[PDB]
Amino acid sequence: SESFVAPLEKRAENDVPLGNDVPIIDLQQDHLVVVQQITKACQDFGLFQVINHGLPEKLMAETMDVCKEFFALPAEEKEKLQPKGEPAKFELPLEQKAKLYVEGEQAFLYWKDTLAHGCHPLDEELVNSWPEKPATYREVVAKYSVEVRKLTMRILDYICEGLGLKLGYFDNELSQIQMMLTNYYPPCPDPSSTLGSGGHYDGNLITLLQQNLPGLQQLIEDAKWIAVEPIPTAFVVNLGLTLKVITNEKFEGSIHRVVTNPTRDRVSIATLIGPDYSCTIEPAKELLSQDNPPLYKPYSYAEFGEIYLSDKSDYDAGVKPYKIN
């Protein structure tokens, strides 16, 4: 279908090499070693994996199971999450009730269905707006949401120590939105022409990604793409464009994409943590000086969000209007 054909320059080459230099960070090393290894990965790559991360492996497996079970539901059930008979778009206002979403660039569509909902804070109103089926989705994903948030806040405090910010710097308005995106990539008859997910930064602060199958790729120097090895019991940590700005580019944001597969489907679980739409984003004043002048002026997260979700002329189109010095 023409609707899914990516522009020639954005098409993935067939043989992308494994990223052997993707850091795999054991969180059960000594505290300072973990801080140093995370700091180095954040400065150099903006993407790393965490293992022995304290989130139950059984819960990771049960969550991947119920997410796969959701995408196996019949059309009559999935229609209940399609407002006015079609998938929702990633556009503001981005509601926290569960919806199925379509995504692309303005023009082609990504070879992807995404279930998305808010996860924080957990109350009856929010969980009652989640999928009704499968029966155990709400029970399992409520537990998963809380555990992934706990691990994310641990990683943000490692990041604080690495940067020389006070512990809890991000335990406020900067992390108040937790969007869980369950991504379904069905088999594609022509992977040479399509993308599961176009190249992007995550616009938010930090993302934890759970995957068990290949398809995730990262952009490194000289327009080189590498493959991010799936470790089913690990989380991939992607630093967002918001953290790039707050660290005044001391940290890299992760530019990543997902390629399609001709033979098998793939489910990934992305937990996108970041600011409320009411937030003002700027480089952390604590880190600035005459030697480290701010590279961004303060901006509205809502204003950024509208650009980020619409303009894909460049990976950092969202923050281009706010660049200074």
Ligand X SMILES: O=C(O)CCC(=O)C(=O)O
Return the ∠ at Cα 140 (arms to 137 and 146), rounded to 5°.
125
Interface with ligand X (CB under 6 A), residue from 34, 47, 50, 209: 209
Contacting ligand X (CB under 6 A), which of 270, 273, 279, 281?
270
CB of 211 to ligand X, least distance (A): 5
Minimum CB–partner distance for residue 293 and ligand X (Å): 31
Q: How far is the CB of 88 from Sr ion (least distance, A)?
A: 11
Nearer to Sr ion, 88 or 160 (CB): 88
The residue (of 76 and 314) whose beta carbon lies closer to Sr ion is 76
Is residue 309 within the footprint of ligand HYO (CB under 6 A)? Answer: yes
> Interface with ligand X includes 182 (CB under 6 A)?
no
Minimum CB distance to Fe ion smaller for 241 or for 281: 241
Q: Pick what 203 binds: ligand HYO, Sr ion, ligand X, none; C-beta below 5 to 8 Å, kind-dependent.
A: ligand HYO
Q: Which stretch binds ligand HYO (CB under 6 A): 60-68, 162-170, 176-184, 229-237?
A: 176-184
Residue list for the binding site for 2-oxoglutarate: 183, 185, 266, 268
**Residue 197 in the binding site for ligand X (CB under 6 A):** yes
Binding residues for Fe(2+): 200, 202, 256
In angstroms, give the least distance from the CB of 254 to Fe ion. Answer: 8
> Quick one: which of 53, 117, 120, 200 contacts ligand HYO (CB under 6 A)?
200
**Residue 64 interacts with ligand X (CB under 6 A): yes or no:** no
For ligand HYO, which stretch binds (CB under 6 A), given 135-143, 164-172, 202-210, 224-232? 202-210
The reply to whether 105 sits near ligand HYO by the rule CB under 6 A is no
Does 105 sit near ligand X (CB under 6 A)? no
Which residue's beta carbon is nearest to the bound Fe ion? 202
Between CA 288 and CA 165 the distance in angstroms is 12
179 binds, among Sr ion, ligand X, ligand HYO, none (CB under 5 to 8 A by kind): ligand HYO
CA nearest to 226, candidates 24, 31, 17, 48: 17
Give the max Cα distance, the chain: 60
HEC states along the chain? CHHHCCCHHHCCCCCCCECCCCCEEECCCCHHHHHHHHHHHHHHCCEEEEECCCCCHHHHHHHHHHHHHHHCCCHHHHHHHCHHHCCEECCCCCCCCCEEEECEECCEECCCEEEEEECCCCCHHHHCCCCCCCCCHHHHHHHHHHHHHHHHHHHHHHHHHHHCCCCCCCCCHHHCEEEEEEEEECCCCCCCCCCCEEEECCCCCEEEEECCCCCEEEEEHHHEEEECCCCCCCEEEEECHHHHHHCCCCCCCCCEEECCCCCCCEEEEEEEEECCCCCEECCCHHHCCCCCCCCECCEEHHHHHHHHHHCCCCCCCCCHHHECC
67: contact with ligand X by CB under 6 A:
no
Q: Which is nearer to ligand X, 145 or 197 (CB)?
A: 197
Question: How far apart are the C-alpha atoms of 262 and 111, rounded to whole Å?
Answer: 12
- Can you give the binding site for ligand HYO, defined by CB under 6 A? 90, 94, 103, 177, 179, 181, 197, 200, 202-204, 272, 274, 305, 308-309
